Design a protein around this ligand. Structure first.
Ligand SMILES: [Cl-]
Ligand code: NA
Lengths: 120, 118
């Protein structure tokens, strides 16, 4: 139906040994938007073993052009060698109502990208 | 000055063992665009050692609201152990001249992201 590209854009080290993984969600400029989302992710090590399962909440976005993206944060104890995350469930707050969101909507970054630096 | 965010968005395996590294460039929504760019990249292993040095060319962009971003591809013999790339030079085709582009303009993705599956 609708489109959400999703990728991890940063990792923030917080007090209390918490790591906050920042995800940017983007509707690609299709300005058919989304209500508040609830996303459940399995955090996995490099071997593919499940570490923890956590939920992530997003604001409503995408019904306009300068609201095409929104940022969400996933919190867990930073003591985990997290390498990948798998979206296993998603919920949309629309109409003040609980509605299930099809996982096919997501366009995840399922590839290790080249890191880019700039010379001095 | 001007702004270009840049990140690697996919790797495409081609016949003849060629790899196409896809880059997304974004001028952040400014009304000042860029002529065709020629970008020189050091492809490096994970240890930071330079493997090969290659050039990447882009279309002109940032000059209309539907060209705020552009996608470029770097084709090379799909070279084993590339982990990172470093921008060491950039040249802009502007007004009949090849002009040097200050590297400070670039806002690179200098971060290893979590992989996401569904
Ligand atoms: Cl044209
Ligand atoms: Na440690």
């Amino acid at each position: 139906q609708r489109y959400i590209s999703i990728r991890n854009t940063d990792t923030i080290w917080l007090p209390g040994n918490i790591c906050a993984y920042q995800f940017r969600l983007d509707n690609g400029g299709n300005d058919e938007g989304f209500g508040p989302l609830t996303i459940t992710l399995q955090l996995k090590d490099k071997y593919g073993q499940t570490l923890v399962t956590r939920k992530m909440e997003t604001e409503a976005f995408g019904d306009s052009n300068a609201t095409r993206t929104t940022d969400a944060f996933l919190e867990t104890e930073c003591v985990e060698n997290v390498a990948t995350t798998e979206i296993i469930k998603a919920t949309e707050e629309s109409n003040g109502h609980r509605v299930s969101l099809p996982l096919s909507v997501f366009d995840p970054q399922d590839y290790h990208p080249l890191l880019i630096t700039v010379s001095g």
